[PDB]
């Protein structure tokens, strides 16, 4: 039932995200003006953030379902929704202007933190996947699981190669957009290096089940990040599918996170904190130099974190 509750919370966030997306359209500018699109998106994102932060602080140090607060987490969906609407209306009551830039910087920091946390989660998920499938390779029919592992890793690497091809075709020119070339070349070379480090026998000796699969997954995620950094480039010479793909990967990570008297399966407080950071990140994404530099540094932090998770046992 706890997993069901986590999935339902993810569902409410997804519904709010879809609402934010739809108001982003030009047609809705007519309706909202009657009370721009980015302003309403900021308002709804602030509602998400404040609600989730409030619930997480409420859920502090809860350790058993015997807590009435555990029931509050489980039930009262209707009161949750009503309080959310009341908050969202309240957001409209805050004056515009300086609040816009304040929330923009708050959203930048939130998106950075969410990217970091989601990335740690992604590395953990990839490691668990690789270990489970190598174990099933050992115990059960070796051929089936070997074929599955090879197909998955090859698929991820081929998709990353296709993304590289598209980015070279679109965001680079023979004698132009040198920033695009720099970013793409650095990301590709560092991804190759990360793959190599994932095979070095000394590294595996300390992490026996660290293999190419998680490397390819990280490479695909890095390719997506770097692409996204380019699509927002203000310079049109160096400049929705990328954001849709990012939303898909975020949904996958949220589902992984989602998937009692003596102990709780997960800290509701920390889960809701992650949810709030997810709201901030989506708010940043759906929409400037900080976006570009944040995304590029996020890709580089991706590769650094993966390399660190692989190497730290060496130290």
């Amino acid at each position: 039932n706890s997993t069901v509750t986590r999935l339902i919370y993810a569902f409410i966030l997804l519904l709010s995200t879809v609402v934010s997306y739809i108001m982003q359209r030009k047609e809705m500018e007519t309706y909202l003006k009657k009370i721009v699109g980015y302003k309403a998106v900021y308002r709804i994102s602030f509602a998400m953030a404040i609600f989730f932060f409030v619930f997480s602080l409420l859920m502090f140090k809860v350790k058993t379902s015997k807590d009435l607060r555990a029931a509050v987490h489980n039930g009262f969906w209707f009161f949750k929704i009503a309080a959310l609407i009341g908050i969202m209306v309240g957001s409209f009551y805050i004056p515009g202007g300086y609040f816009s830039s304040v929330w923009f910087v708050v959203g930048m920091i939130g998106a950075a933190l969410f990217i970091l946390i989601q990335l740690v989660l992604l590395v953990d998920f990839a490691h668990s996947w690789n270990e489970s499938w190598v174990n099933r390779m050992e115990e059960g029919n070796p051929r089936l699981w070997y074929a599955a592992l090879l197909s998955f890793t090859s698929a991820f690497y081929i998709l990353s190669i296709i993304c590289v091809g598209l980015l070279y075709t679109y965001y680079t020119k023979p004698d132009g957009c040198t920033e695009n070339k720099f970013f793409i070349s650095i990301n590709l070379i560092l991804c190759v290096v990360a793959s190599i480090i994932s095979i070095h026998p000394k590294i595996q000796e300390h992490q026996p089940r660290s293999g190419l699969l998680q490397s390819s997954l990280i490479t695909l995620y890095t390719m997506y990040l770097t692409w996204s950094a380019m699509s927002n480039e203000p310079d049109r010479s160096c400049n929705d599918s990328d954001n849709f793909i990012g939303l898909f990967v975020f949904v996958l990570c949220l589902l992984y996170s989602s998937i009692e008297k003596e102990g709780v399966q997960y800290s509701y407080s920390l889960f809701h904190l992650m949810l709030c950071l997810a709201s901030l990140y989506i708010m940043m994404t759906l929409t400037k130099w900080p976006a570009v530099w944040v995304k590029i540094s996020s890709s580089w932090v991706c590769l650094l974190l993966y390399v660190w998770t692989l190497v730290a046992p060496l130290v």
Binding site: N130, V134, M137, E138, P142, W145, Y146, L149, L150, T153, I199, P201, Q204, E205, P208, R209, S210, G211, L212, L213
Partner: peptide, 16 residues
């Protein structure tokens, strides 16, 4: 078992 440094990790399934 003859565990070996295979690409998919450090295992012995291929050489049990």
């Amino acid at each position: 078992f003859y565990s070996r440094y295979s690409w998919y990790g450090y295992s012995y399934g291929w050489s049990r």
